[PDB]
Amino acid sequence: ALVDYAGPAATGGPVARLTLNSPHNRNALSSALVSQLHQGLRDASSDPAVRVVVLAHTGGTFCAGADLSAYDMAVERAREMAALMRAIVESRLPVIAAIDGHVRAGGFGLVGACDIAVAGPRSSFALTEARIGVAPAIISLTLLPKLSARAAARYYLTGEKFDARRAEEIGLITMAAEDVDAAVDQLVADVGRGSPQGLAASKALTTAAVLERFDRDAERLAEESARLFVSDEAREGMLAFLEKRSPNWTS
Amino acid sequence: ALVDYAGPAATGGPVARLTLNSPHNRNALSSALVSQLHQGLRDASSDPAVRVVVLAHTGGTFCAGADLSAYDMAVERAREMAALMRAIVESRLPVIAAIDGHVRAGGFGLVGACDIAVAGPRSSFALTEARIGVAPAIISLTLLPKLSARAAARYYLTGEKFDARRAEEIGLITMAAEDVDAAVDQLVADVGRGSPQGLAASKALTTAAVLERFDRDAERLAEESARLFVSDEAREGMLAFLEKRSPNWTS
Amino acid sequence: ALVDYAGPAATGGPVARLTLNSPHNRNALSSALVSQLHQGLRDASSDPAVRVVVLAHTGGTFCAGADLSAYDMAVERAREMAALMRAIVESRLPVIAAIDGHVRAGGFGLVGACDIAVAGPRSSFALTEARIGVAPAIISLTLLPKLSARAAARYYLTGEKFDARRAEEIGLITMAAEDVDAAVDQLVADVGRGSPQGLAASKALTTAAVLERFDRDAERLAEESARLFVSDEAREGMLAFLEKRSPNWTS
C-alpha cells in the first residue's frame, strides 16, 4: 500500500515520479495508497522545481480498482475515489500517466483524471461493472468528458476487454506506445519547456468543464455507487465471480 | 406501417428484436409505426427475461424519415419524433441498431438515439435537409452529443452522402461491419452478460447529458422544425425535388 | 493589414472569398485587418447572392496571431479576438477556412471559429503559449468544443508542432487535403446547393453550444489573457524568445 515519490534530484528533470507500488493487491486503491498518492501530489506541487508529474506503476497491473453500515463504507470509498481524481484535475501540475499493464474499475478514474495518458503493449482495459450488477458511476466524472459518446456507451454496456490502440482510438488514453518510458520522457521534455504559470493556466482551461462536472455530480454518483454496491444483484454478481461461476441472470 | 416484435422465446436469447417492417414507404416514420415502436419498447421492457433490444429493419432502407394548420401538424410530427427518441434513450434496456441500408432525416434521430449502432455494406447516410430549405433540428437532440463537432457542421452543411466506415469515423454509428447480423449477435452476447440493474444504471450514466438536452431544447427544436417546414423556401425546396428539377436558389 | 473581398461576380459562384493579405507581418491579427475582416463578413452577409464564405490567405502563413495600461490594451486585444470569432460563428453563412501554411496563437481561434476548415501540405500548427508563460485562453472559446479532450490537453501542454493530418485527426480542422483549392471548391459546390434559410438554420444548430460558451466565458478569458500577458513570467518568456535564448525556468 505504498506510493514511491521521486523528485527532480532523482528524476534528473523538472519532474516528480509517483509510482504505485502495491503489488500484493495488484495496486488496488486502498485508503493508505490513496492518502500517499494525495501526499505525493502535495509534495510535487510544493516543489517549485517540479513542472510535471508522472504517475507510474510497478507490476503488470496499473490499477485494479478498490480493494476489500456497508452503505456508509461504500459511499465513502466512492467519495475518496472522487476526491483523489479531483486532486489530480485541480493540480497546477500537468499529470502524465505511464501505463503498461491492466486497468480495471477505479483505475479508469485515475487514467481519466490525468491530463495525458500513455499506454504500452502490456496494457488491457475492461469495464465489467455491469457484469457484476453495478455501474462505473464515480469514474464517469473523468471518463465521460474524454471518451467519444459511442465508445463510452459501447464499453460500459458490453464489458468487453480492449488494448492500448483501441484506448487511444476512443479517448481513454492519449497515445499507445511500444516503449512507454521513451514516449513519456519525450512528453516530459516538451511539457517541461512550459512555464509553471503557463502550464497551470493552460491546464485549468482544459479542466474547467471537468471540475464543473464534479461539482454537479460527485455526491450523486457516490450515493448511487453505494446503493448499487449494497444491492442484491451486486451481491450475487460478486459471489458468482468469486465462486467462479456464472451469475443467476446469465445461465 | 408495422413493427415486428420478437421476444426471448423467438430470439433464443435475453433479447427482443423490433424489426421495422414498412416496405411500402421504405420504413418511413408514420404515426402507426411510431406507436408500434413505442409499444415494442414497452413490451420489451415489460419482459424481465429481456436484457437488450435490437432495432432491425427489412428492405434496403433502415428509415427514410417522416412520411406524408400545416404548422400544427409539423410541430406535432417533430414532437412525436422527439418522444420516440426519448423513449429509446430513457429505456432501462440497452438498444442496438442493426443497420444495413439507407438512413435519411428522422432515421438519423433513431440511429442517434440507440446506445449502440452497427451498419453494413449496404448502408448510406445523407443530411440533405439544407438542400430543401430546412434543417436537421429535432434529430440534433441525439446527433449533436454523439457526432464530432467538425463532422456535424460538415455534413449538416454540405448535405453530402457517406458510407458506414465514415459514419463510424464520425460517431454516427458505433461500428461498420461487413456482416451486421454477426456483429450484433456478438454485441448481444456481451451486453447480455450484464445484470438488468447494472445495464440500466450504466446506460443512465451515458444518457443523462442527452436527456438534459431534450429537457432544454426539445420544444424549441420542434417549433423551429415546423416554422421551417411551412416556410416558402422549403415549399420551393420540396417542389423542386418532386418536379425533379433544381431549386430556385440553385440555377 | 488588408483583407481582399471577392464576391460572386468575381468568384463565379454563390461564394465570397475573403483573403487575408498582410504578408509584412505574416498575416498577424492587427486591428485594421480585424476591422476589415468584420467588414468582409458584413458585405458577404449583405449579398443575397452569397451562400458561403471562404476564408483564404496569401503567403506561407495563414495567421500567426496578434501583432505588436498594458493590461487594458491586452484585455481589449483579447476582446477583439473574441468578437471576431463570434462574428464568424454568428453568421448566417457557413464559413470555410482554406489553409495552406502556418497557424499560431489567435490563428487557432480563427480556424476553430470556421464551420469547416481544410488544410494543405504546407500547413503547421503549434500551441507554444505555455512556452512563453501564457495560455491559449481566448481561442479556447472555439478550440475546446471542437478538439477531442485528450488532444486539447496534450497540445496545450506540450506545445509540440503538428501537421494537417494530425489536425484533422484531433478535430482542429475538418480535412487534410493535398490540393486545398480543389477540396474547398468541392465543399463550396455542395454547401452552395443548400438554401440560405436551410444553411443558416443548420449552422445555428451547430453553433448554439459554442455561443453559449462565449456568453459564459468570453469576458473571463479576456481578463485572464491580460493578467497572463502582463505577468513577469510572460515578460521573461517573451524576452527569451526574442533574445533567442532559453527562458529562465528552462536552463
Side-chain angles (χ1 to χ4, degrees), chain B residues 155-176:
Chain B
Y155 293 108
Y156 271 40
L157 297 178
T158 61
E160 63 197 299
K161 168 160 62 168
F162 57 95
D163 64 15
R165 303 286 166 174
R166 176 48 50 73
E168 164 170 4
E169 294 176 3
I170 65 170
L172 174 57
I173 64 177
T174 314
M175 77 173 77

Side-chain angles (χ1 to χ4, degrees), chain B residues 136-205:
Chain B
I138 204 77
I139 66 185
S140 294
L141 291 171
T142 59
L143 288 199
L144 298 186
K146 300 187 195 187
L147 266 49
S148 79
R150 290 308 191 179
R154 174 187 182 162
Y155 293 108
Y156 271 40
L157 297 178
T158 61
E160 63 197 299
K161 168 160 62 168
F162 57 95
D163 64 15
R165 303 286 166 174
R166 176 48 50 73
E168 164 170 4
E169 294 176 3
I170 65 170
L172 174 57
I173 64 177
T174 314
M175 77 173 77
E178 190 173 59
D179 183 346
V180 173
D181 294 343
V184 177
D185 283 355
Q186 184 57 67
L187 294 169
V188 164
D190 294 324
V191 168
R193 298 175 61 65
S195 108
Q197 172 182 87
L199 292 172
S202 301
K203 169 178 177 157
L205 287 173

Side-chain angles (χ1 to χ4, degrees), chain C residues 36-53:
Chain C
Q36 289 177 36
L37 201 46
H38 274 280
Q39 195 63 56
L41 298 166
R42 199 54 237 138
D43 299 345
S45 188
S46 295
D47 189 350
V50 172
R51 291 197 292 284
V52 59
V53 178

Side-chain angles (χ1 to χ4, degrees), chain B residues 130-137 140 144 149-150 152-154 156-158 160 216 220-221 224 228 231 233-234 247 249-250, chain C residues 51 94 111-112 114-116 145-146 171-175 187 190-199 201-203 205-206:
Chain B
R131 305 286 189 82
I132 61 175
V134 302
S140 294
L144 298 186
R150 290 308 191 179
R154 174 187 182 162
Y156 271 40
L157 297 178
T158 61
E160 63 197 299
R216 275 190 47 255
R220 180 182 82 71
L221 294 178
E224 184 206 1
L228 287 171
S231 67
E233 274 188 48
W249 56 80
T250 316
Chain C
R51 291 197 292 284
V111 175
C114 291
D115 306 278
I116 292 176
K146 300 187 195 187
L172 174 57
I173 64 177
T174 314
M175 77 173 77
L187 294 169
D190 294 324
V191 168
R193 298 175 61 65
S195 108
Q197 172 182 87
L199 292 172
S202 301
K203 169 178 177 157
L205 287 173
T206 65

Side-chain angles (χ1 to χ4, degrees), chain C residues 153-168:
Chain C
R154 174 187 182 162
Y155 293 108
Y156 271 40
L157 297 178
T158 61
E160 63 197 299
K161 168 160 62 168
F162 57 95
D163 64 15
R165 303 286 166 174
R166 176 48 50 73
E168 164 170 4

Side-chain angles (χ1 to χ4, degrees), chain A residues 109-129:
Chain A
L110 273 183
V111 175
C114 291
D115 306 278
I116 292 176
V118 179
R122 303 194 324 175
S123 306
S124 90
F125 305 85
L127 288 169
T128 41
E129 278 78 0

Side-chain angles (χ1 to χ4, degrees), chain C residues 59-101:
Chain C
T61 296
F62 176 73
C63 183
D67 81 286
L68 207 150
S69 64
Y71 177 94
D72 303 331
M73 203 163 304
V75 65
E76 277 301 299
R77 276 202 312 280
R79 291 190 186 124
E80 286 187 350
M81 192 62 252
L84 178 60
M85 297 168 61
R86 176 156 200 157
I88 291 169
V89 182
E90 282 185 326
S91 171
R92 63 167 181 98
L93 299 170
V95 178
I96 307 177
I99 303 155
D100 206 4

